[PDB]
C-alpha cells in the first residue's frame, strides 16, 4: 500500500455511485503504511535529514488526506445501502459498521464503545427494475434496479421468484 | 504557530524540476519529472528548482477554453490540466517569497482562466443532466464525474424523467 494506490481508489470511488470493491485488507494495509511512514519519519528527524524527513511527513499527510476523502464517499454509500436495504461487498470493518447503521434503522440497540409477528427476510438478486413494494409490516421495500442485491421479506421475495423477477442469494 | 495547509497535492501531476544538489542518483543541473507534492517539498528545501512551465500551462487552458465555447459537447481535458494549473499557481504564489512582479500578474490570469474553465464545464454538466450516460464520464475529471452522478440522482428522484 502507498499513496499511488490510494489515489487510484479515490478516483474509483468518485467515478461510480456504487461501493468500489476493495481488497479485504484495505484498512489493515492502510494502517501499516502509516505505521511504516511513522517509523521512517522519526528514523530520519533524529538522524538529521530535514529533507528525507520532510518527504516522509508530506507522504503521511497525503495518506491521511486521501483516506479521509475515500472514507467519506464510502460511508455515504454505506448509509444509503443500509437505508435502502441493499447489499454489496465491503471490508469486514464496514460490515460491522453497516450492522450498526442497520441496527439503528430497525430500532435495535447500538452499543457504547402464528408463534411470532417478526417478518422473516432473505437476500435476493433483483432481475428487473421494480417499484417500492409493501411488506406485511407496512414498511415499503425499494425501488430496486436490476442487478441490486436486497434484503426483503421472504413473503415478497418468494412472489418475485415465481414471477421471474428475483432469485435467492447467499449473503 | 498554526500551519494553514491550503490546497493539497497528492501526486496527480508531474512537475519538471531542475536539480540543484546531489539528492539521490540525481546529479546537479539535470532536469527531472516528479509528482507535484514532491516538487513543492524539494523546492522548499532548495534541492530542486521549478522549471517555469506557466507559459505552456496558461496557453494550454486557453486552447481548451476555446474548444469548449465552440462545439456543445464537453471535451476531454489533457491529463492533469486542473492539478498542473494548481501547482504553477502555488509556484507563482510562493515565488514572490522566493529564497536567497511580471509573475504576480500571471498568477491572476491562471486563476481567472482555471476558474473560467471549471465553470464552463460545470454549466455544461448541469445541462447534460437534463438530457446518466457512461460515454460522458469517460470525458470528465474524476471530481466532475462525482458531480454529474450526484446531479442526476437528485434530478431523477425529483423529476423521475429519462
Numbering used by the authors:
A (entry chain A): 1 to 113, 129 to 186
B (entry chain B): -6 to 93, 101 to 131, 134 to 164
Could you give the paper's own sentences about this structure?
On the other hand, the archaeal GINS appears to be either a tetramer formed by two types of subunits in a 2:2 ratio (α2β2) or a homotetramer of a single subunit (α4). The GINS complex from Pyrococcus furiosus increases the cognate MCM helicase activity, in a similar manner to eukaryotic GINS, in spite of the lack of a eukaryotic Cdc45 homolog. In this paper, we report the crystal structure of the α2β2 GINS tetramer from Thermococcus kodakaraensis (TkoGINS), which consists of the Gins51 and Gins23 subunits.
The crystal structure of TkoGINS was determined by the multiple isomorphous replacement method with anomalous dispersion (MIRAS), and the atomic model was refined at 2.65 Å. The crystal contains one pair of the Gins51 and Gins23 subunits in the asymmetric unit, and the protein forms the α2β2 tetramer generated by the crystallographic two-fold symmetry operation. Gins51 is composed of the larger α-helical domain at the N-terminus, and the smaller β-stranded domain at the C-terminus. In the Gins51 subunit, the long linker region between the two domains is disordered in the crystal, and 16 residues could not be assigned in the electron density map. Gins23 also possesses similar structural domains as in Gins51, but the order of the two domains in the sequence is permutated. The crystal structures of the TkoGINS tetramers revealed a stack of a two-fold symmetric dimer of the AB-type subunits (TkoGins51) onto another two-fold symmetric dimer of BA-type subunits (TkoGins23). The overall fold of each subunit and the tetrameric assembly of TkoGINS are essentially similar to those of human GINS. Thus, to determine whether the Gins51 B domain is required for the stable tetramer formation, we examined the oligomeric state of a TkoGINS truncation mutant, lacking the B domain of Gins51, by gel filtration.
